[PDB]
Amino acid sequence: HMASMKKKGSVVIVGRINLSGDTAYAQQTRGEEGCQETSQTGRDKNQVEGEVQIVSTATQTFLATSINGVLWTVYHGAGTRTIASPKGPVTQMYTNVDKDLVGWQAPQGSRSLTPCTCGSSDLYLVTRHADVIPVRRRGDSRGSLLSPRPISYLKGSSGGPLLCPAGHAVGIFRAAVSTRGVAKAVAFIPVESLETTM
Ligand SMILES: COc1ccc2nc(C)c(O[C@@H]3C[C@H]4C(=O)N[C@]5(C(=O)NS(=O)(=O)C6(C)CC6)C[C@H]5/C=C\CCCCC[C@H](NC(=O)O[C@@H]5C[C@@H]6C[C@@H]6C5)C(=O)N4C3)nc2c1
Ligand SMILES: [Zn+2]
């Protein structure tokens, strides 16, 4: 009934992938209980830091990556949801279901990656466990893992970055090509597609 219809909660930042020093490591900044409460109100007062955020809904958890002042993630994780912020829910400024892409304004305190113009095919994928996986670019939006591993290790890392040797953002992790449960290649949203969407 109309009086009963509920509203989906906001995406909530629950942690980050720390790439500050020489050792990548995941940090949690908000627990389950706090995440639930923040998703309902859309009011997140936590300080935000870094380029790669760990984000959650009531049912999913994935990554979001800041590039050129926009926090990017995948549509199949975020849908059309708002993101929580200190002043309330923030509406998406980019939504493209054909690209599996959404974006909000980068939160205050975050840092943005620079789009890559190197043209290099030696990439690095950052997972939600702070694993840095070498990936060879095989096309406009595909890349192969130098060391294949079960898809279990990539699950929950959509929205994470593929980086060039210089640490520029080359793309956003979107999907995994699996053979008998082994991820041999990944699909990503090229940064050029982000720059065109912008
Ligand atoms: C609804 O509107 C839209 C619009 C566009 C759209 N576009 C997609 C390509 C898509 O695909 C979905 C989600 C994605 C995924 O799970 N992505 C992760 C990830 O981690 N998600 S997540 O855990 O964070 C989660 C679910 C958010 C919380 C990185 C993977 C990690 C492990 C894979 C797990 C088994 C799955 C293997 C699968 N493979 C594959 O589809 O391969 C194909 C497409 C291209 C390579 C070829 C053939 C795969 O990867 N999928 C399945 N849904 C949509 C939906
Ligand atoms: Zn580069």
**7 and 104 inside one domain:** yes
Residue 12: name the closest of 105, 27, 91, 36 by CA.
36
Residue 17: name the closest of 148, 192, 173 by CA.
173
Q: If you compute the radius of gyration of the chain from its CA atoms, what whole number of angstroms results?
A: 16
CA distance 25 to 34: 22
Per the CB < 8 A criterion, the answer to whether 118 and 130 are in contact is: no
Per the CB < 8 A criterion, the answer to whether 27 and 16 are in contact is: yes
CA distance 103 to 69: 10
Domain span holding position 179: 114-198
Query: Where is the domain boundary, 56, 78, 113?
Result: 113
Whether 122 is a known active-site residue: answer no
Ligand 1 atom nearest 177 alpha carbon: 46
Segment holding 100, helix H or strand E: none
What are the CA-CA distances from residue 85 to residues 38, 40, 147, 156, 177 (Å)? 9, 12, 38, 22, 34
Whether 143 is a known active-site residue: answer no
Going by their DSSP bridges, the two strands 101-105 and 132-137 should be labelled as unpaired
Ligand 1, residues at Cβ distance < 6 Å:
60, 62, 75-77, 97, 100, 151, 154-158, 173-178, 187
**3 and 92 inside one domain:** yes
CA distance 145 to 133: 7
- Write the single-letter amino acid at 138: R
Q: What is the CATH number of the domain that holds 15?
A: 2.40.10.120
Expressed in Å, this structure's resolution amounts to 2.1
